[PDB]
């Protein structure tokens, strides 16, 4: 899993908005530096900037 290091406000209809400290699971990372993620915290799914999160156990 990953943890958000910053808040992120969606900038596209495909993005996932999140707050710092949310825990996310990566659904797919095969397209580039924007990863498809699912928030374990909020249940929402969408693309995130991969440099805004850090790995977690």
């Amino acid at each position: 899993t990953f943890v958000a290091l910053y808040d992120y406000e969606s900038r596209t209809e495909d993005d996932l908005s999140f707050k710092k400290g949310e825990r996310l699971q990566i659904v797919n990372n095969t397209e580039g530096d924007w990863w498809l993620a699912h928030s374990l915290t909020t249940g929402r799914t969408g693309y995130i900037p991969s440099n805004y999160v850090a790995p977690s156990d």
Binding site: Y6, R11, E31, G32, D33, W34, Y47, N51, Y52
Partner: peptide, 10 residues
């Protein structure tokens, strides 16, 4: 906050 990455390429 860091700059955002470029959007994904197909």
């Amino acid at each position: 906050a860091p700059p955002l990455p470029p959007r994904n390429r197909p």
